[PDB]
Design a protein around this ligand. Sequence first.
Ligand SMILES: Nc1nc2c(ncn2[C@@H]2O[C@H](COP(=O)(O)OP(=O)(O)OP(=O)(O)O)[C@@H](O)[C@H]2O)c(=O)[nH]1
Ligand SMILES: CN[C@@H]1CCc2c(ccc(O)c2O)[C@H]1O
Lengths: 54, 283, 337, 282
Amino acid sequence: IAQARKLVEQLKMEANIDRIKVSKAAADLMAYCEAHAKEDPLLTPVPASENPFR
Amino acid sequence: TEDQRNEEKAQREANKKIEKQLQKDKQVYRATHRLLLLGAGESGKSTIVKQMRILATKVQDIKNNLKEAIETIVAARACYERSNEYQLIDDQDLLRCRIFETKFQVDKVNFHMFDVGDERRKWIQCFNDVTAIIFVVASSSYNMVIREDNQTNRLQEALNLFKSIWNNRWLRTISVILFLNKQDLLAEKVLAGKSKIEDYFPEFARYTTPEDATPEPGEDPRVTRAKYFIRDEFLRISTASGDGRHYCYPHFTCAVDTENIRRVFNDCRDIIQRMHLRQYELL
Amino acid sequence: LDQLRQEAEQLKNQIRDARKACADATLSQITNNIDPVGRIQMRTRRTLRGHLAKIYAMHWGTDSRLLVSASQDGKLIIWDSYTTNKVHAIPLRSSWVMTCAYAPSGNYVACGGLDNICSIYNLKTREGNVRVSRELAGHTGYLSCCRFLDDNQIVTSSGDTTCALWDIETGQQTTTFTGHTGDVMSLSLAPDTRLFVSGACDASAKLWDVREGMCRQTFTGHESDINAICFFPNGNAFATGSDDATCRLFDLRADQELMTYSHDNIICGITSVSFSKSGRLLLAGYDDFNCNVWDALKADRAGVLAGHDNRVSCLGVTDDGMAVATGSWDSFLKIWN
Amino acid sequence: VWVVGMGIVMSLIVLAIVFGNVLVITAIAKFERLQTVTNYFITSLACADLVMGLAVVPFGAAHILTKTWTFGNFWCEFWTSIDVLCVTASIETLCVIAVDRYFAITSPFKYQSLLTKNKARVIILMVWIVSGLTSFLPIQMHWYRATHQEAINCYAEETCCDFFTNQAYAIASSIVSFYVPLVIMVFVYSRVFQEAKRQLQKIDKSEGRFEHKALKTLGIIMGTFTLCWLPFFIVNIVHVIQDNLIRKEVYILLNWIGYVNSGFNPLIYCRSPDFRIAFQEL
Ligand SMILES: Nc1nc2c(ncn2[C@@H]2O[C@H](COP(=O)(O)OP(=O)(O)OP(=O)(O)O)[C@@H](O)[C@H]2O)c(=O)[nH]1
Ligand SMILES: CN[C@@H]1CCc2c(ccc(O)c2O)[C@H]1O
């Protein structure tokens, strides 16, 4: 029962944490994606002049 | 462009020197056959490797085993009679004592044998390009139980493993070689009236000796039927599926004696021959 | 011991209530306004050949020009994507290799497999000879993945349900991580190199702390063994590979499942996952002979990469997001753009 | 006017051979999985058959239909040399394939070391060279021509040419083309059948619980080639023994019958599931 005793205390630590709403995280992710979508060569094809593999 | 001309030559030398070396190594890899050892615990995997390898500290280690064996007997002549009730561990002296890769050559042919190395069995997906799989069981341990759970028959435990290996998605085109070890212990146990085989396996009562048999002249009738009963159970699972891409090669062998007169070589020859002969559209 | 066991069930009930109270709406409701990406088709630019057997591992370099591949043949070959030229071929003592890495400084390469020993090699050697530098041998179980934090640190994960942080200078485990009940198969560090996750075979994912050495958040609900894991560029999310042809995206702050990517016609497994530079495309391999490109914010297929003749066992994306490289079991590397 | 009806079928037959050979040749280059040491001989046979169908079938059909030749005597000699070279090439490849099969089945252990890409290339180059040598060298040296009034009359004639040969060259060509490979192929396939029967018997013994296919496969493989080629070579070797025994019409008909082996070869060969899948892909 020694192994079970140690595992019990760990679950207590995880319970007492701060949490936020899902909507805020969704908005943050959408804002990050919108901000960084410009410099993404995979999405917007690069010109053949500036294409290292072409 | 001047800079590239100096640089390109170096990448050409490296690509060249390396490409020539890798081409040579292809012949070595192609002309080599690999084998895998599998089975249940306390079966004799190391003894088979010891016999094949035959083609100090060990004495002290055997002495330590003797001391452990003596202590085990003390805790348990009359104690040895009840050795079936409790778990007990069983050139000539080397085999008696209790990833390991061994490479040997027979008839100018390169062979590679690596040991197994755990009920998840996730590493099995790696050995998808092996010539054959060697599977070893103990044919004289039906009245025994695995240590972790005392509710499971040692022997039945071995089959539950063969069916899982046989009905595996990755090992769909890999043949299996069967070694039914510990034959000498079976002969002595069956002759004794005690520990009847029919007590544990009810189907043995209605079993009959097959017409197509080849008992050694010396062996008693009772023993042969018993021996053939174990093999028949194993082959029943193998013959259920396979669709011609799977083949099992049962054998009877005793780890003490070197009955292995190049039989692994002969079996691998037949397996490769069958692979070639069925590779064509029909032959 | 019944009171202690019953106390554990009491904690689980409180966690579910707190998580349920923090779900205003699903992500799909919020992201319905965006326009679809469309159809994306990429053609193979370079094909890399010269391997003798199946390939398990792959990793790009800091310069996004050099990559290293590991195969069951026992050879560790370093390529050059721009000009298709081999640079080194390091022989291995063991023929079973399951992972590889590459240093950010480009001076060290790691390896591991069924030998239960993590090996490290030196590239920029004096006298120009590659040679084993250290042999980290104190461990049990077959390794699964290895990553470099710096020139003197490395993290490893194996099949003995433990993760450890090594030290090259002393060759001893500075700290060890415990708590998993199954084989650990994948891990990925954060850009800040302060937190790292690990997906085990018990259908759970955990977020560890390098300095503290204790678990912080355990995720759940996969319903099958996790076989790969990636990490979002923004640093607040990570996606998980699946036996059940399902990719799930988790959030650290919300501590909730956001979306599940699935399709009716697929019943195969998942071997590798990765993200893009902008965190919009979720590339992933499959056991049904090709790879599919998903949409992170829409769960809609936007292209098929079917240029392979065998199963896909690795995948990687360059740091600058210029090309995608995928391996296979037929000893062929392909570069897509 | 039965010529119009017969001519239509000839056009379809010629086109079928080219279409079948083209698909086989293209598959090996397009897909990397099909390439192997064995497929080199198949590719060589397909190329030879395609060359034959593209070169000698149309000119021969046009000459038969129009009953006149306008290109000239040099073109007739070149066409005859090309036809004999193409015929000599196809048969030799099949014997090589049979020898390769026998090597693979009999000694699997040494098969990998005995066969190499360089060795296969050398063997196929030697086969092509020996096929070409017996065709161009005797024909162009004009030692082909025999001594007869009909022979000199045909040689002097400009608009018509016919296949008239001396006994010695006919015997040599028949021996080097047909008779020599046939005995080797028969012995190879008999040994293969014996080994397969022994293996099947051994397999039957191991499992009490729970060779039509091999016999059928060997039968079709041997019989198609034998029935296609034996009568023509028999009548060719009988022609030089006695002139009045056989006429030219039956000779031409049997020659045309023998031409069809080029079209039959791609159907019987390369019938593996991988080949069918690759063909259906494109
Ligand atoms: N009497 C007898 N003993 C045998 C025979 N084969 C093996 N043994 C003994 O069985 C013991 C245990 O088998 P090992 O070879 O050590 O077992 P292993 O290879 O480690 O296989 P696992 O225990 O399954 O991992 C050995 O010490 C041998 O002395 C046999 O045919 N007869
Ligand atoms: C014009 N047709 C020729 C005539 C005789 C002949 C052929 C082929 C192979 C030979 O060894 C021959 O002697 C035929 O293709």
